[PDB]
């Protein structure tokens, strides 16, 4: 059995080859133990604060909401060491790795932010890190490939399939199945087999906890809605977690709409997929009628995945959280809007969240509403990508 519930309703589980159950069981045990260990929590806190730079700021956007009744705040995970929220749970998983006596790290990465986070944590904590990254992403998120190498991490291009996140995930799992005795697989999102969705949420929940404290102190009340982009689901659940029991607070997850849902070229399995079993979990999948896992698409490598974390599938099922999609173009307009009017260059992943918020305001400009957008990361890694697109347009 297991110490913790591997499911969120019907979603979740540990659908991995028998050979990996001991590793999963060991990880769960180590996590549960670490959660009751004062020394572990202190070491985690110390790293988050003095090394990563938490708490991150909560920035009010006065310019972009001008002339509307929308007040918009941005949780600045883009200011976290490394450039994205990814760094948070990586510091925790690295500590768990050491706790388990593992000396190596396996990680998958799409936007490269998790790769960079895994590399820096490994460099700091004395672990040998190897990162799988789809070849397409090696190109569209290149700044991060350089960062990873510079920090001593081995970056391994994956040319199989769509050569993106999904494929990097496949390789990471194959690798772990054959090296779990010495290597810890530092999964980068709230998905995969239990206990990862649980561990990743818990090691990212500080985002929402800080957001709540900061919003209360600045506004005297809770947000009408917190908005986050949803790839595998880590920054979103990290933001949502602490607000779940606050029923008045809207939880909005923004899945990539790619070139549009009707084109089939998107990464929105939650609202346009079908429940399936893949990557060690039973969750919504973009899949063919035959049961084959389809290839996803999104201008942002970080959201380019054909599935989603099981807790998001659950929260949507019971109606606690609402999920929507934002197309490439909508994300791009949000990206430019933030750059020019607030002086912040957001990651294209984060831009999807900001795009929905801007839609919510524009569509009903006289609706009074307090919104918080989780700015999961900065867009330095997306500069060249965005430039080339804006060039081909003028």
């Amino acid at each position: 059995t297991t110490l913790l519930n591997p499911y969120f309703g019907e979603f979740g589980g540990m659908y991995v080859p028998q050979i990996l159950m001991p590793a999963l069981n060991q990880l769960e045990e180590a996590f549960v133990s670490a959660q009751k260990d004062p020394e572990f929590q202190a070491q985690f806190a110390d790293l988050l604060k003095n090394y990563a730079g938490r708490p991150t700021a909560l920035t009010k956007c006065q310019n972009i909401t001008a002339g509307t009744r929308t007040t918009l705040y941005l949780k600045r995970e883009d200011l976290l060491h490394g450039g994205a929220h990814k760094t948070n749970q990586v510091l925790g998983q690295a500590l768990l790795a050491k706790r388990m006596g593992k000396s190596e790290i396996i990680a998958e990465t799409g936007a490269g932010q998790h790769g960079v986070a895994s590399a820096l944590a490994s460099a700091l904590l004395g672990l040998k890190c190897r990162i799988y990254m789809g070849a397409k992403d090696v190109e569209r998120q290149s700044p991060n490939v350089f960062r990873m190498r510079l920090m001593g991490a081995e970056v391994i291009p994956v040319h199989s399939g769509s050569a993106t996140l999904k494929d990097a995930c496949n390789e990471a799992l194959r690798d772990w199945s054959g090296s779990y005795e010495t290597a810890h697989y530092m999964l980068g999102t709230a998905a995969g087999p239990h206990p990862y969705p649980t561990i990743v949420r818990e090691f990212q929940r500080m985002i929402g906890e800080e957001t709540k404290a900061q919003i209360l102190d600045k506004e005297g009340r809770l947000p009408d809605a917190v908005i986050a982009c949803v790839g595998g689901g880590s920054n979103a659940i990290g933001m949502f977690a602490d607000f779940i029991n606050d029923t008045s607070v809207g939880l909005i997850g923004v899945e990539p709409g790619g070139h549009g849902i009707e084109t089939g070229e998107h990464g929105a399995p939650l609202k346009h997929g079908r429940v399936g079993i893949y990557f060690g979990m039973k969750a919504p999948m973009m899949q063919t009628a035959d049961g084959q896992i389809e290839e996803s698409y999104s201008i942002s490598a970080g959201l380019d995945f054909p599935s989603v974390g099981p807790q998001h599938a659950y929260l949507n099922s019971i109606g606690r959280a609402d999920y929507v999609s934002i197309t490439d173009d909508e994300a791009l307009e949000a990206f430019k809007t933030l750059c020019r009017h607030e002086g912040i260059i957001p990651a294209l992943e984060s831009s999807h969240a900001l795009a929905h918020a801007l839609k919510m305001m524009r569509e009903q400009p006289e609706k009074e509403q307090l919104l918080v957008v989780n700015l999961s990361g900065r867009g330095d890694k997306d500069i060249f990508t965005v430039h080339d697109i804006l060039k081909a347009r003028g």
Partner: protein, 263 residues
């Protein structure tokens, strides 16, 4: 009772079983069918067959490519079941085992999947990414449709797992040779083999990395009722894609050698 009858006969002849593995539809439907008849004519005691899946996470490159090839030839799961029907129509007694990925089984309904397996004559089903911990609905559906649910006994198995596998399994017990994914180049148990027999687990077949006659004999000598070879077989398929004739010839040669080693 195809597996029961095979192991009974094999036991009398005091030999182990050789079970080759191939992905259905690789490199194509017609050629795949011939490949399988050759495997049987060459000496295969039972079959282990895979159905092309978009993301075979328990497989290395060799079988990944096998799946890609089957996909290039437009091979679908439906066509795989038509093939299984034909194979069973030509070979009424050979035990047929499927190696599946969970989504393909879960897709149109778990029960419907095993109902189809029973309809085409399949004897067992091994779902690679479904550990005993998530097996309830699968093992139950299998038994309801007279399909033997196959469980893996990993080299890092503890006593509780040995016991679970022993009571839940039917047909045969898949004894993993090593950790990792499928692959002939990676070569990997007496104690585990003994414990299974103690708990009356279905006969054990060793798999993963078995690519030479020597490995076959070793498994049998160690107590295993037989061995399974996949990647080694599949490798002969891809190296002879240009000459189908030499492909079958090479396959027959190899299977005979592997089978003889089990005598």
């Amino acid at each position: 009772e195809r597996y029961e009858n095979l192991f009974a006969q094999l036991n009398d002849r005091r030999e182990g079983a050789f079970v080759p593995f191939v992905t259905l539809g690789d490199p194509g439907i017609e050629q795949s069918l011939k490949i399988i008849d050759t495997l049987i004519d060459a000496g295969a005691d039972a079959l282990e067959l895979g159905v092309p899946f978009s993301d075979p996470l328990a497989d290395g490159p060799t079988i990944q490519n096998a799946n890609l090839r089957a996909f290039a030839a437009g091979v679908t799961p439906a066509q795989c079941f038509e093939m299984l029907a034909l194979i069973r129509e030509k070979h009424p007694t050979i035990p047929i085992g499927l190696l599946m990925y969970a989504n393909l089984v879960f897709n149109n309904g778990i029960d419907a999947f095993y109902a189809r397996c029973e309809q085409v004559g399949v004897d067992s089903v091994l779902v690679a990414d479904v550990p005993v911990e998530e097996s309830a609905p699968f093992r139950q559906a299998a038994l309801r449709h007279n399909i033997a649910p196959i469980f893996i006994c990993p080299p890092n198995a503890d006593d509780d797992l040995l016991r679970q596998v022993a009571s839940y399994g039917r047909g045969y017990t898949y004894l993993l040779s090593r950790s990792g994914v499928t692959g002939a180049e990676n070569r990997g148990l007496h104690h585990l083999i003994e414990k299974l027999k103690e708990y009356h687990a279905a006969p054990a077949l060793q798999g993963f990395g078995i690519s030479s006659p020597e490995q076959v004999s070793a498994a049998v000598r160690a107590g295993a009722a037989g061995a399974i070879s996949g990647s080694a077989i599949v490798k002969i398929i891809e190296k002879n894609l240009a000459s189908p004739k030499q492909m079958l010839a090479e396959l027959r040669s190899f299977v005979s050698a592997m089978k003889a080693a089990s005598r």
